[PDB]
Design a protein around this nucleic acid. Structure first.
Lengths: 255, 255
DNA sequence: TCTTTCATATGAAAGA
DNA sequence: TCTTTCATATGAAAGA
């Protein structure tokens, strides 16, 4: 009954996350950067209707807020399904080019998995839900990610922007990985006998025995929930001696 | 009156050359080569008429002879003039591929000219006329360069081939350069004070004084005529302190 | 809608 | 006429 033992740690029961220990993020711009305002491309009603529910949900969650900004990038309608229901995809390339680069500290999967000993063969894999959105964005950096939102027959103001680290931003993967690392530093200390691999929002906990993986997982879920992160109970692979992680199938210590 | 002093050395008065000291050339084939017979491409009457005079001239000169050979390559009509009179150009690529490679000993112009001292500023430039044709081809290697020749209203046999080193053959430049070098070895010895640069059929004689270039040129022309080679009196640049050679303008020791 | 990268296609130019 | 090399052109595929 893992789901019932940790209501706060699961995305399905704890609600949208928010990394309470993490200071809102400030995004430094390159020395010569000037705001860029790209006009929203005309969107068909079908695309607009498909995307609308998502935008309203984000507005209700406080993830998106109204604003007036000298910055503006295109909102694209992308239909993932065979050919149904669109999802909003912001083209932040012109913003990314004006943001100062940071060193990429996210290790590649191959190197990351090299730190997995043969001794620990009991695994638990957790996938953090809406990870980036868990990291707040400082009010000063929020205007940078603005886009235009219209509602033909009667639309609100015009521009909306994010209050959390957004998708499409070049440094989101790295900033999230580093923030979670800071938040889980203590856990690594109070659990020297465990192996924890972090790849942005993909986590792998390794133990020597089933029990250790059991007690370890409880502690990790507990800690994650308290810190403000949320794991997908649906995808969770708990205390298995065989799991799928980062495109690899871990079994008998292979791959 | 250079032309009158050396009737045998000039192409205009000595007739077609023939390197009498040079043994007829034998062309070694690659170890796995088999004869290749490529059908002559249909030729328009205009092209055929343009080329005809050249073929007859070569037949009269003994440069071309009738033959029956398992080898055959295409004869191409190429009109050099703005758009008039064609000249025969044999496509010997399939033959070249079956001939054993030899080391390229013809130096590049740049390196060749590097052997020209500042001391010798009096120059003479000679261009050997129909140089390759001066070198006989051994009867055994003649069948290799055969092509088909037709004369619609009544044509002779069919195939013709060369009795002299032909144009289009990959090793002609090198074999000619080496043969002339062998024939002019003595001259270089009896004239230590002269500079002789050889680039296939392009010759440059350098002297320190006008007189030396004068006496030197006489000796070279004499020797060339006796050996069977012929220089173009028309193009000849005699005892000039400024001449055009291999695309360069030699003046004051520059270039 | 845009941009960027990489593969496949044409085409021109030489030469035998 | 054929072949070979190199430049210019399209086009497809990804992704934000």
């Amino acid at each position: 009954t893992w789901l019932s033992d940790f209501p706060q740690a699961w995305a399905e029961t704890g609600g949208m996350g928010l990394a309470v220990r993490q200071a809102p993020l400030i995004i430094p711009l390159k020395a010569t950067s000037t705001p860029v305002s790209i006009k929203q491309y005309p969107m068909s009603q079908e695309a607009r209707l498909g995307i609308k529910p998502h935008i309203q949900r984000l507005l209700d969650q406080g993830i998106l807020v109204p604003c007036q900004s000298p910055w503006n990038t295109p909102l694209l309608p992308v239909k993932k399904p065979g050919t149904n229901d669109y999802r909003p995809v912001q083209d932040l390339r012109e913003v990314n080019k004006r943001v100062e680069d940071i060193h990429p500290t996210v290790p590649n999967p191959y190197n990351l998995l090299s730190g997995l000993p043969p001794s620990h063969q009991w695994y638990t894999v957790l996938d953090l839900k809406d990870a980036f959105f868990c990291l707040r964005l400082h009010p000063t950096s929020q205007p940078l990610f603005a886009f235009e939102w219209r509602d033909p027959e009667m639309g609100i103001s015009g521009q909306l922007t994010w209050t959390r680290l957004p998708q499409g931003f070049k440094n989101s993967p790295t900033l999230f990985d580093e923030a979670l690392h800071r938040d889980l530093a203590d856990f690594r200390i109070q659990h020297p006998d465990l192996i924890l691999l972090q790849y942005v929002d993909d986590l792998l906990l390794a133990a020597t025995s089933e029990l250790d993986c059991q007690q370890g997982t409880r502690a990790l879920l507990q800690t994650l929930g308290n810190l403000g992160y949320r794991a997908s109970a649906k995808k969770a692979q708990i205390c298995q001696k065989q799991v799928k992680y980062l495109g690899y199938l871990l079994k008998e210590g292979q791959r």
